[PDB]
Amino acid sequence: AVQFVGEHVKVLEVRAPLDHAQRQGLPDFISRQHVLYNGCCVVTAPKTLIEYSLPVPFHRFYSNPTICAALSDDIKRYVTEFPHYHRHDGGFPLPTAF
Amino acid sequence: DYEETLRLFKTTVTSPNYPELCYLVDVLVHGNVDAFLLIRTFVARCIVN
Amino acid sequence: ISEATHPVLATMLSKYTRMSSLFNDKCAFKLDLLRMVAVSRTRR
Amino acid sequence: MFHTRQLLVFAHSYALVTLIAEHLADGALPPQLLFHYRNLVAVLRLVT
Incomplete structure (x- = not known):
């Protein structure tokens, strides 16, 4: 099924x-x-x-830092440095271009 | 008969043991319909397994 | 992986040595090899 | 100890609860016990 892959x-x-x-x-x-x-x-x-x-x-529906930290080490050191973003409700920063 | 449906949906979206193949095949089909017709026999065993 | 061990590789390497450009993205050409192998071995 | 019993080893000292939840993120384990230890340290970060 490689013939119909995305870009x-x-x-x-x-x-x-x-x-x-x-x-x-x-x-x-x-x-x-x-x-x-x-x-x-x-x-x-x-x-x-x-x-x-x-x-x-x-997106705010899909920016859960509890699993997004284990995918890149910058986000992991971002969340173990900053304690206030463990709560998944909000306040965890969004990328400023978005 | 919809409470079993939402029950299974919640238990499979909150599951820690989700199979990690699904992201690659989801971006591999890329929402195309004729790509899925070849996976018409690949999904039919994996769903039951 | 040689040309003497596969007919499809020896078939498409004439196509690949025909075009001279864009050799730096080797993974793109290898993915195109993968997709021509995939379309070559269908059953319908 | 999850097979023959329903207990939990290293559920009595904080310094190994954190090491289980951190240094076992590579895998080599079913995800359910990692889910349990992540939820316990989430209860800790909630009660703080």
């Missing part, structure tokens, strides 16, 4: 206006979303695929 991991920015019924409040504002084109919803840290693993905590 590469691509994170995007969906710059979005709104409908003419809701842009009455500040019409020159545009929202910019953030999507993943390649990849999937991942839940368990792959113990065998650690070298090829590029963790992308790009």
Whole structure:
């Protein structure tokens, strides 16, 4: 099944206006979303695929640092340095480009 | 008969022992439909196993 | 892995030595070899 | 000790609970006991 593989991991920015019924409040504002084109919803840290693993905590639903630290050592030293980001509810920082 | 469905779904998304093949084959099919027709007999044993 | 031990490798290496560019991404050419081997051995 | 009993070795000294939860992240173990030790140190980081 190698004949239908994807290209590469691509994170995007969906710059979005709104409908003419809701842009009455500040019409020159545009929202910019953030999507993943390649990849999937991942839940368990792959113990065998650690070298090829590029963790992308790009969304607040999917930026759980309890498993995102075991995929890159920068995030691991980030979470063992900073104690306030153990709680998965929020406050764990998002990438500033996103 | 939907409470068993959400029960199995929660126990398989919160599972620590999820098989780590699923990410590679998910990015390998890349949401294509004709790529899955060859995996039509690969998934049929792994699901039951 | 030699040309005398596989017909598909000796078949596609003429194609690979035909094109001269983009030799630095060897994994791309090896992945294309993998996918032509995969499409060559289907059953339908 | 998980087969013949339902107990837990090294569930009585903190300095080995952390070493079990940290230095066994490579694998070589079913993920259930790592889940248990991660949840225990999460209860510790919750009660703090």
